[PDB]
Design a binder for this molecule. Structure first.
Ligand SMILES: NC(=O)c1cc(F)cc2[nH]c(-c3cc4c(s3)CNCC4)nc12
Length: 343
């Protein structure tokens, strides 16, 4: 049996849960006979990304439907689906490419999880064995600490279709992140920010850290180009947990992010290089946390102030977001297990 505290053991169970992996592939309508969970290829996913990028290129120009259909067909030939009574949906627009790209993102992290879970060598509990494979130190933050109270206040005030309840707070330290982050600790404007993702991605996120979309992947849906995205509103990030009322539990990260000088934008702009002297993008929202209630936690700004009007004139965004284009600018500090109370 395992030496780990019960919440840590349950975290390990939920992120390595194989039923959840197969359930995800079934909901994507993947043919599990043609492409089993155990036979996912990073190389196969890579090629699929490029097909999707070519599809998006064709769509953007305006191309022969015969060309769009041959590309769309090439994708489903590479990634095998079983749509039952229906015909495969034609990949001929932006929303459709994005959905399939976001599905590839998820499949890659599932492959990382299943690879971790299958690999390795008797005396130890499988919970402990699989814990160590995350290369991440995970401690339970006590409910009656200033840390947990600051964090719980952050969840209450920046929650603006569900109520949010914090079940467990874990303090986390990924191997190598301390060293990788240390130069960026010199930048001013360090902020504690939210980052949400599906539960089936968290074995990948913890072993590899938050990553940037590969260049093969379509840029569709990335308002500010390929980067790592964060919110100062727990609601905005919690939507990326994709939590179903079937299983109303999600996982969400708090990261220390070294923003430096922010390139502040009101509208979509696919970034490929920041201006000199800029180290992050800030998307400006209609609503921002009240800056008078900014508090500090271990030298990092926590923007937990309740939502007020920002006064930004012509904004496309309801809330702020923050993007960095270097993976070393992120120091993952906490992992929250959240209960979504839908109402
Ligand atoms: N995860 C977050 O917490 C988050 C927070 C934000 F404030 C804005 C975000 N945007 C995204 C995107 C993820 C993906 C996109 S946008 C486009 N297609 C591939 C996958 N995540 C956030």
């Amino acid at each position: 049996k395992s030496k780990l505290p019960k919440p840590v053991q349950d975290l390990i169970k939920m992120i390595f849960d194989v039923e959840s992996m197969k359930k995800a592939m079934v909901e994507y309508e993947i043919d599990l006979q043609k492409m089993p969970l155990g036979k996912l290829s990073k190389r196969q996913i890579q090629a699929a990304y490029s097909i999707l990028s070519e599809v998006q290129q064709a769509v953007s120009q305006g191309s022969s439907d015969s060309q769009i259909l041959d590309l769309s067909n090439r994708f489903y030939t590479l990634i095998p689906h079983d749509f039952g009574m229906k015909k495969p949906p034609l990949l001929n627009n932006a929303d459709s490419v994005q959905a399939k790209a976001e599905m590839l993102d998820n499949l890659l992290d599932i492959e990382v999880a299943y690879s971790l879970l299958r690999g390795g060598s008797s005396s130890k509990d499988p919970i402990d064995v699989n814990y160590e494979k995350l290369k991440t130190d995970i401690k339970v933050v006590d409910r009656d600490s200033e840390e947990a109270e600051i964090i719980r206040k952050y969840v209450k005030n920046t929650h603006a279709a569900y109520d949010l309840e914090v079940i467990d707070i874990f303090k986390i330290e990924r191997e190598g992140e301390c060293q990788r982050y240390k130069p960026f600790k010199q930048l001013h404007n360090r902020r504690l920010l939210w980052h949400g993702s599906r539960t089936t991605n968290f074995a990948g996120i913890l072993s590899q850290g938050l990553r940037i979309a590969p260049p093969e992947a379509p840029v569709t849906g990335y308002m500010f180009g390929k980067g790592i995205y964060f919110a100062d509103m727990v609601s905005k990030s919690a939507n990326y947990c994709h939590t179903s009322q079937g299983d109303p539990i999600g996982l969400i990260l708090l990261g220390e992010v070294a923003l430096g000088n922010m390139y502040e934008l009101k509208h979509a702009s696919h970034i490929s290089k920041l201006p000199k002297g800029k180290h992050s993008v800030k998307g400006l929202g209609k609503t921002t946390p009240d800056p008078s209630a900014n508090i500090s936690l271990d030298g990092v700004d926590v923007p937990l102030g309740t939502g007020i009007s920002s006064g930004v004139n012509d904004t496309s965004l309801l809330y702020n977001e923050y993007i960095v284009y270097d993976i070393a600018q992120v120091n993952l500090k906490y992992l929250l297990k959240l209960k979504f109370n839908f109402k």
